[PDB]
Amino acid sequence: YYATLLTLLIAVIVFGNVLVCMAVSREKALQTTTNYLIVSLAVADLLVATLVMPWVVYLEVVGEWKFSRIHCDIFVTLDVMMCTASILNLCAISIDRYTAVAMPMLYNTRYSSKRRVTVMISIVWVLSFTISCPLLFGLNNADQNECIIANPAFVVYSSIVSFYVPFIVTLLVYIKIYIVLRRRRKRVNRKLSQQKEKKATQMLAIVLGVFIICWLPFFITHILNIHCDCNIPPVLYSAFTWLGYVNSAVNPIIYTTFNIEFRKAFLKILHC
Amino acid sequence: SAEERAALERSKAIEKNLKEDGISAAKDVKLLLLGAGESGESTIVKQMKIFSGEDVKQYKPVVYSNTIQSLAAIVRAMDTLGIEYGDKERKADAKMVCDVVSRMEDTEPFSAELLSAMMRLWGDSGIQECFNRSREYQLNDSAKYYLDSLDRIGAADYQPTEQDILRTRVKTTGIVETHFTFKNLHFRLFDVGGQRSERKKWIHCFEDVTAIIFCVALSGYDQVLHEDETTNRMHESLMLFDSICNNKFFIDTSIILFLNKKDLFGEKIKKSPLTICFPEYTGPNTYEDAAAYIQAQFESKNRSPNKEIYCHMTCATDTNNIQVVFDAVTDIIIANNLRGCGLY
Amino acid sequence: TASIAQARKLVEQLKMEANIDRIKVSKAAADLMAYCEAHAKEDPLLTPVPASENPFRE
Amino acid sequence: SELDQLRQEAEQLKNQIRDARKACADATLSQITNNIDPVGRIQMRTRRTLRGHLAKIYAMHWGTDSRLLVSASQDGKLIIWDSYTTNKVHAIPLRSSWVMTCAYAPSGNYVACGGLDNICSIYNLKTREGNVRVSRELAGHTGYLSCCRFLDDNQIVTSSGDTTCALWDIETGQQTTTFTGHTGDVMSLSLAPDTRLFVSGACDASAKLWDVREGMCRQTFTGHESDINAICFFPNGNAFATGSDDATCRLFDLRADQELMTYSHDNIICGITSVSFSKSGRLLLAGYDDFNCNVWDALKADRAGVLAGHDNRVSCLGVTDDGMAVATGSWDSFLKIWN
Ligand SMILES: NCCc1ccc(O)c(O)c1
């Protein structure tokens, strides 16, 4: 009955993400491949906050899922689909930045630019559907009013495909982008230009750190809670699950408040 | 209707060709070349251009049409000057040439009849006299050359060129496009040397240029022309540099600055070392410190956080010019891509 | 003496223009209005043309 | 000596011209038109959008059939559009992509273009092959071409950034008449309805009325402070209007030898890139650097309406001969047809 204290999280997730969508939809300066991937991320966060989080609150209010079984199967499927889509959008953003540095001539164009954005967004939503799809039938094995994902056939598969592979992708790519930025920094060698590189060597760390801290403890618990008898009370599992959505609340700021064009778009939107 | 479908097929063919051309055209690097005098512009262009048959192979129909239009001009000279042909029949041939020109058919395939009549016209002493009186009626002497060789222009059907003048395009003046490649990048350098006109009106057309290459001479630190009203080349170079650096259309366009004639500069600074242009300069009377001061004078004109100036000192015999531009372009593109992501 | 030839050309141009006849502004304005009024009913931007007649709306 | 006498005579002649001007400048259109109704609010909408250019559009011109529109952009492609269906009719590659002006012949047989290469290129649109090729190149200018307009199939008027205009014989490929007297670069031309007179606007802001057959400047007009970017004629041939970098448009009458009206507004801080009139001459249209085109009531010096569908500076305007449609083009690579 204290689930309603999570209401502000929903309000925050939607608010920040709508600003991102409007920042792009109300502006033309913000028409880049990174801005399109950022909007896709904002959409995944808006959909998890709108379609999943109110039911997370309903379930926390009353621990018994006093609703239909079909509704739960849909809720669970959307929860997985939207969280997976958000993570995969983070991967798409990281790889687009890699292309931007590793192959500057392919990034700075219009035809291959549109093709890369179309392919990355499509593959993100295709994989999120494919991964969550098995939860629409059979394997959920829900019992009475409890409809929590706990089937190893899906839990291990989903954890590996939705997180660990995407996880290892961004960190190596982000580190490699840093290796390239650092090796060029040490050759180009007035203080601000090194400082601008330094902000990059700090902003990359921010993107990686928030991703790692928000999703890592959930998926370890997610597998461990089924793997063996262990000290995982429902309060810890739920706390990590909520942290997973906190990541969705965080994304709009680390992705859009460092970009001056987004700051200007936000000031226009906010009448500031 | 069938007519509308035919129109749609033509429209689709046009759209397809426009898209394919846009796709290939976008894969390039655009560089604008500026300076405030003769400077090192010609030196940097010659050095960058380490296409040679490209124009030669492509202008055959142009030389051909110039040859025929000129021959018609000669016929006009014939009647204007009062120079008659020995064979009056050739006057009818002269009329044919004028009709070819007036019908706008001088770019069309050259028939046997046109060759026979034009060769008959060319061998007449009155056509050579028309050139002898070219001072009264203006005739194209290059076309004269091609007319002397007209038998080859006609009988061969196609030949890239008969002259290495490259049509000269001396009157073309205007903008001179230099195309080249290096490593994996293609470049188009726009040597805008002939635009003796107001820059405000034509500068905007280069707003989307990848980078601006600006060439100044170090030896100009004390070089004053009478046309400069006591001002030296260094100050004219700095004033133009500042004008372009803060131009509203180039706020985020990076500049690659070449300081040329470093040898003449180093030798000249033995006497009056940088005192003449920068009387306030204080420091060792050396090549390195005078050069550092001058470069600082150019560096100080960059007032945009999203712009940088690349500097390199050159010598006419110093061939390390293509790699410098290549590297500067690479860093400019990377910086622009990094700002797209917002990393940096 | 190039500036003298230029001054001569300027003087001749001004002497020519100085002898051009002129009409009153109120008359020119009245004629301009008369033209606009006479054809006002004919101008598709002042009198919108119905879609059955307007080739861009049909 | 002689130089000072000639300079003083020139000053006396300018003073005499100014006084001759005051002799007639005792009325204004802005007062005489207080006796007529306003056009009211004009709410034009786009009916067609023309897509295809991949670069800033610099020139556009309507043909005499009100159906075929020609445009040119930095892509180096001159495109002929069917304004009713959006179907493309022609795409002409250019030998030089630095194109700033174009025109459509009144006969529908020829088109022209030019720019920073100082060459005016005339193309033949009616061929046996079905392809379009260069019919002529007009060389002899020493600066960029700012405007080209056809008088007839065999005669074209050019204006360049060489302080001069010229009348060219297309069939011969040579200049036949030159128009001198400008000091700054000349930005635009407009031809009279009867082809016998034309006007030009210059950086020095002195627009001039030229006699096509005489080869001399017949009238000099002043009023702007900065460069004049666009000029057009009033449909009856007795008046013209100019736009400048002063965010001002001015209407002049050739027989009055006077400026009749000034078009300005407190909220316009962008210059004028194009000026045109409606068939009746009642509406004056001007393109601006704030990504829109204002429609002015030419007899009121007020705002009739605004066309504001562009994302970049407006570069060209035109009106059909019958007044049925207004076309615009801008640096955003799109063309629009307004009705
Ligand atoms: N509720 C957090 C989202 C979630 C839940 C289960 C999963 O297997 C998964 O990959 C993601």
Short mmCIF file of N, CA and C in Angstrom, two decimals, chain B residues 173-266:
data_model
loop_
_atom_site.label_atom_id
_atom_site.label_comp_id
_atom_site.label_asym_id
_atom_site.label_seq_id
_atom_site.Cartn_x
_atom_site.Cartn_y
_atom_site.Cartn_z
N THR B 173 39.13 32.65 -65.91
CA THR B 173 39.42 33.36 -64.66
C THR B 173 38.50 32.71 -63.63
N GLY B 174 37.72 33.52 -62.90
CA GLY B 174 36.68 32.99 -61.98
C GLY B 174 37.18 32.05 -60.91
N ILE B 175 36.51 30.92 -60.74
CA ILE B 175 36.89 29.96 -59.66
C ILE B 175 37.61 28.79 -60.32
N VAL B 176 38.75 28.39 -59.76
CA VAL B 176 39.51 27.34 -60.40
C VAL B 176 39.45 26.13 -59.48
N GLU B 177 38.83 25.06 -59.95
CA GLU B 177 38.63 23.88 -59.14
C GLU B 177 39.77 22.90 -59.38
N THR B 178 40.43 22.50 -58.31
CA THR B 178 41.51 21.52 -58.37
C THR B 178 41.01 20.26 -57.68
N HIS B 179 41.03 19.14 -58.39
CA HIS B 179 40.56 17.90 -57.82
C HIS B 179 41.75 16.99 -57.61
N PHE B 180 41.76 16.28 -56.49
CA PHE B 180 42.85 15.35 -56.22
C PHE B 180 42.40 14.34 -55.19
N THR B 181 43.19 13.28 -55.04
CA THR B 181 42.98 12.34 -53.96
C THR B 181 44.28 12.17 -53.19
N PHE B 182 44.13 11.71 -51.96
CA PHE B 182 45.27 11.35 -51.12
C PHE B 182 44.79 10.30 -50.15
N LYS B 183 45.54 9.20 -50.06
CA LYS B 183 45.13 8.08 -49.21
C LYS B 183 43.72 7.69 -49.62
N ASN B 184 42.78 7.73 -48.68
CA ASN B 184 41.41 7.34 -48.95
C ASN B 184 40.45 8.52 -49.09
N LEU B 185 40.93 9.75 -49.22
CA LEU B 185 40.03 10.89 -49.36
C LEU B 185 40.18 11.61 -50.69
N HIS B 186 39.04 12.03 -51.23
CA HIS B 186 38.97 12.88 -52.41
C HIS B 186 38.81 14.32 -51.93
N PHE B 187 39.46 15.25 -52.63
CA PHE B 187 39.35 16.66 -52.29
C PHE B 187 39.06 17.50 -53.52
N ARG B 188 38.29 18.56 -53.29
CA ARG B 188 38.01 19.62 -54.25
C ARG B 188 38.46 20.93 -53.62
N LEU B 189 39.51 21.53 -54.18
CA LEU B 189 40.06 22.78 -53.68
C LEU B 189 39.57 23.89 -54.60
N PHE B 190 38.94 24.91 -54.02
CA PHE B 190 38.39 26.00 -54.80
C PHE B 190 39.34 27.18 -54.67
N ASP B 191 40.11 27.43 -55.73
CA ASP B 191 41.09 28.50 -55.81
C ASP B 191 40.35 29.70 -56.37
N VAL B 192 39.84 30.54 -55.47
CA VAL B 192 38.97 31.61 -55.92
C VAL B 192 39.84 32.83 -56.16
N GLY B 193 40.59 32.81 -57.26
CA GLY B 193 41.53 33.87 -57.55
C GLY B 193 41.01 34.97 -58.45
N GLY B 194 40.01 34.66 -59.27
CA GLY B 194 39.51 35.63 -60.23
C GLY B 194 38.34 36.47 -59.80
N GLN B 195 37.83 36.29 -58.58
CA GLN B 195 36.65 37.01 -58.13
C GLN B 195 37.06 38.36 -57.56
N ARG B 196 37.36 39.28 -58.48
CA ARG B 196 37.73 40.64 -58.11
C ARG B 196 36.43 41.42 -57.97
N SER B 197 35.70 41.06 -56.92
CA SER B 197 34.34 41.50 -56.68
C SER B 197 34.08 41.45 -55.19
N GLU B 198 32.90 41.92 -54.78
CA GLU B 198 32.56 41.99 -53.37
C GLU B 198 32.37 40.58 -52.80
N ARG B 199 33.15 40.27 -51.76
CA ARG B 199 33.15 38.95 -51.14
C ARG B 199 31.86 38.65 -50.39
N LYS B 200 31.23 39.70 -49.88
CA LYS B 200 30.01 39.45 -49.09
C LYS B 200 29.05 38.70 -50.01
N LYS B 201 28.91 39.18 -51.25
CA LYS B 201 27.90 38.57 -52.15
C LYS B 201 28.22 37.11 -52.47
N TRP B 202 29.48 36.75 -52.74
CA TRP B 202 29.75 35.35 -53.16
C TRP B 202 30.25 34.41 -52.05
N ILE B 203 30.62 34.92 -50.87
CA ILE B 203 31.23 34.03 -49.83
C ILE B 203 30.23 32.96 -49.38
N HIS B 204 28.95 33.33 -49.23
CA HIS B 204 27.95 32.38 -48.68
C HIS B 204 27.89 31.08 -49.49
N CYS B 205 28.35 31.08 -50.74
CA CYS B 205 28.17 29.88 -51.53
C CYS B 205 29.09 28.77 -51.05
N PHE B 206 30.08 29.11 -50.22
CA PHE B 206 31.04 28.16 -49.67
C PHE B 206 30.77 27.88 -48.20
N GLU B 207 29.59 28.24 -47.72
CA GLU B 207 29.24 28.05 -46.31
C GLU B 207 29.43 26.60 -45.86
N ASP B 208 29.17 25.64 -46.74
CA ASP B 208 29.26 24.23 -46.41
C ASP B 208 30.62 23.63 -46.73
N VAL B 209 31.64 24.45 -46.96
CA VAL B 209 32.98 23.94 -47.23
C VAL B 209 33.51 23.22 -45.99
N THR B 210 34.20 22.10 -46.21
CA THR B 210 34.74 21.36 -45.07
C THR B 210 35.77 22.19 -44.33
N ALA B 211 36.67 22.86 -45.06
CA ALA B 211 37.68 23.64 -44.37
C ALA B 211 38.15 24.78 -45.25
N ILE B 212 38.70 25.81 -44.61
CA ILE B 212 39.30 26.93 -45.32
C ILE B 212 40.81 26.85 -45.17
N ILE B 213 41.51 26.92 -46.29
CA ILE B 213 42.96 26.97 -46.33
C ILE B 213 43.33 28.42 -46.59
N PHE B 214 44.14 28.99 -45.72
CA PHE B 214 44.48 30.40 -45.83
C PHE B 214 46.00 30.47 -45.90
N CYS B 215 46.51 31.13 -46.94
CA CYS B 215 47.96 31.22 -47.14
C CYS B 215 48.48 32.64 -47.00
N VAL B 216 49.51 32.81 -46.17
CA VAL B 216 50.14 34.11 -45.97
C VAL B 216 51.63 33.88 -46.14
N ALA B 217 52.38 34.96 -46.34
CA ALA B 217 53.82 34.85 -46.46
C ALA B 217 54.50 35.52 -45.28
N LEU B 218 55.47 34.82 -44.69
CA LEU B 218 56.25 35.37 -43.59
C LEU B 218 57.12 36.53 -44.06
N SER B 219 57.61 36.45 -45.29
CA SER B 219 58.48 37.48 -45.84
C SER B 219 57.75 38.79 -46.03
N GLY B 220 56.44 38.79 -45.87
CA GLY B 220 55.65 39.97 -46.03
C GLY B 220 55.67 40.85 -44.81
N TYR B 221 56.40 40.43 -43.76
CA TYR B 221 56.41 41.20 -42.52
C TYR B 221 56.89 42.62 -42.75
N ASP B 222 57.70 42.85 -43.78
CA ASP B 222 58.17 44.20 -44.09
C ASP B 222 57.99 44.56 -45.56
N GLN B 223 57.14 43.83 -46.28
CA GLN B 223 56.97 44.03 -47.72
C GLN B 223 55.77 44.94 -47.95
N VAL B 224 56.04 46.16 -48.42
CA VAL B 224 55.02 47.17 -48.65
C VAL B 224 54.98 47.50 -50.14
N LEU B 225 53.82 47.35 -50.76
CA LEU B 225 53.65 47.72 -52.15
C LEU B 225 53.08 49.12 -52.23
N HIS B 226 53.29 49.78 -53.38
CA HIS B 226 52.72 51.11 -53.54
C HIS B 226 51.20 51.05 -53.52
N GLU B 227 50.64 49.95 -54.02
CA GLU B 227 49.20 49.74 -54.04
C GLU B 227 48.62 49.57 -52.64
N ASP B 228 49.47 49.29 -51.65
CA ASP B 228 49.02 49.04 -50.28
C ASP B 228 49.00 50.29 -49.40
N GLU B 229 49.35 51.46 -49.94
CA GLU B 229 49.29 52.73 -49.21
C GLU B 229 50.02 52.68 -47.86
N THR B 230 51.28 52.23 -47.89
CA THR B 230 52.21 52.09 -46.78
C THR B 230 51.93 50.87 -45.90
N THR B 231 50.82 50.16 -46.09
CA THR B 231 50.53 48.98 -45.28
C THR B 231 51.29 47.80 -45.86
N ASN B 232 51.81 46.93 -45.00
CA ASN B 232 52.53 45.78 -45.53
C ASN B 232 51.62 44.58 -45.75
N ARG B 233 52.19 43.55 -46.39
CA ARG B 233 51.45 42.32 -46.66
C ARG B 233 51.03 41.60 -45.39
N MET B 234 51.84 41.64 -44.34
CA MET B 234 51.47 40.96 -43.11
C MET B 234 50.18 41.53 -42.52
N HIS B 235 50.03 42.85 -42.55
CA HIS B 235 48.81 43.44 -42.00
C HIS B 235 47.61 43.19 -42.91
N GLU B 236 47.81 43.19 -44.23
CA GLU B 236 46.68 42.89 -45.10
C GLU B 236 46.25 41.44 -44.91
N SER B 237 47.22 40.56 -44.70
CA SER B 237 46.95 39.15 -44.49
C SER B 237 46.20 38.94 -43.19
N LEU B 238 46.61 39.64 -42.13
CA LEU B 238 45.92 39.52 -40.85
C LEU B 238 44.51 40.12 -40.91
N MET B 239 44.34 41.24 -41.61
CA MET B 239 43.01 41.84 -41.69
C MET B 239 42.06 40.95 -42.46
N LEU B 240 42.53 40.31 -43.54
CA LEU B 240 41.65 39.42 -44.27
C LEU B 240 41.37 38.18 -43.45
N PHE B 241 42.39 37.68 -42.75
CA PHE B 241 42.22 36.49 -41.93
C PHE B 241 41.16 36.75 -40.88
N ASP B 242 41.25 37.89 -40.20
CA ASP B 242 40.26 38.22 -39.17
C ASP B 242 38.88 38.37 -39.78
N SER B 243 38.79 38.99 -40.96
CA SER B 243 37.49 39.17 -41.61
C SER B 243 36.82 37.83 -41.92
N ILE B 244 37.58 36.87 -42.45
CA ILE B 244 37.01 35.56 -42.76
C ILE B 244 36.76 34.75 -41.48
N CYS B 245 37.64 34.86 -40.49
CA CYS B 245 37.50 34.09 -39.26
C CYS B 245 36.20 34.39 -38.54
N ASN B 246 35.77 35.65 -38.55
CA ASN B 246 34.58 36.05 -37.83
C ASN B 246 33.40 36.30 -38.76
N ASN B 247 33.46 35.76 -39.97
CA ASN B 247 32.36 35.88 -40.91
C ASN B 247 31.21 35.00 -40.42
N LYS B 248 29.99 35.55 -40.50
CA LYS B 248 28.81 34.86 -40.00
C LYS B 248 28.57 33.52 -40.68
N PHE B 249 29.13 33.29 -41.87
CA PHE B 249 28.89 32.03 -42.54
C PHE B 249 29.96 30.98 -42.23
N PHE B 250 31.04 31.36 -41.54
CA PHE B 250 32.16 30.47 -41.26
C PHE B 250 32.45 30.37 -39.77
N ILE B 251 31.42 30.55 -38.94
CA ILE B 251 31.61 30.58 -37.49
C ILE B 251 32.19 29.25 -37.00
N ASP B 252 31.74 28.14 -37.57
CA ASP B 252 32.23 26.82 -37.18
C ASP B 252 33.11 26.16 -38.24
N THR B 253 33.67 26.92 -39.18
CA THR B 253 34.50 26.33 -40.23
C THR B 253 35.97 26.49 -39.87
N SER B 254 36.66 25.36 -39.73
CA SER B 254 38.06 25.34 -39.34
C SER B 254 38.95 25.91 -40.44
N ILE B 255 40.08 26.47 -40.02
CA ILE B 255 41.05 27.08 -40.91
C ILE B 255 42.41 26.39 -40.79
N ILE B 256 43.00 26.08 -41.94
CA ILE B 256 44.33 25.51 -42.08
C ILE B 256 45.20 26.64 -42.58
N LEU B 257 46.08 27.15 -41.73
CA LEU B 257 46.86 28.34 -42.05
C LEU B 257 48.29 27.97 -42.43
N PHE B 258 48.70 28.37 -43.62
CA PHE B 258 50.06 28.13 -44.09
C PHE B 258 50.86 29.42 -44.06
N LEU B 259 52.02 29.36 -43.42
CA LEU B 259 52.95 30.48 -43.32
C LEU B 259 54.07 30.13 -44.29
N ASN B 260 54.05 30.73 -45.48
CA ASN B 260 54.96 30.33 -46.53
C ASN B 260 56.22 31.20 -46.53
N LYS B 261 57.14 30.89 -47.44
CA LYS B 261 58.38 31.64 -47.60
C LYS B 261 59.17 31.74 -46.29
N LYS B 262 59.26 30.63 -45.57
CA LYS B 262 60.00 30.63 -44.30
C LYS B 262 61.49 30.86 -44.48
N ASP B 263 62.04 30.55 -45.66
CA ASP B 263 63.47 30.72 -45.89
C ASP B 263 63.79 32.20 -46.09
N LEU B 264 62.98 32.87 -46.91
CA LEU B 264 63.20 34.29 -47.14
C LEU B 264 62.97 35.05 -45.85
N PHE B 265 61.99 34.62 -45.06
CA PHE B 265 61.72 35.24 -43.77
C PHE B 265 62.92 35.10 -42.84
N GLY B 266 63.42 33.87 -42.70
CA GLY B 266 64.54 33.64 -41.80
C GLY B 266 65.76 34.44 -42.19
#
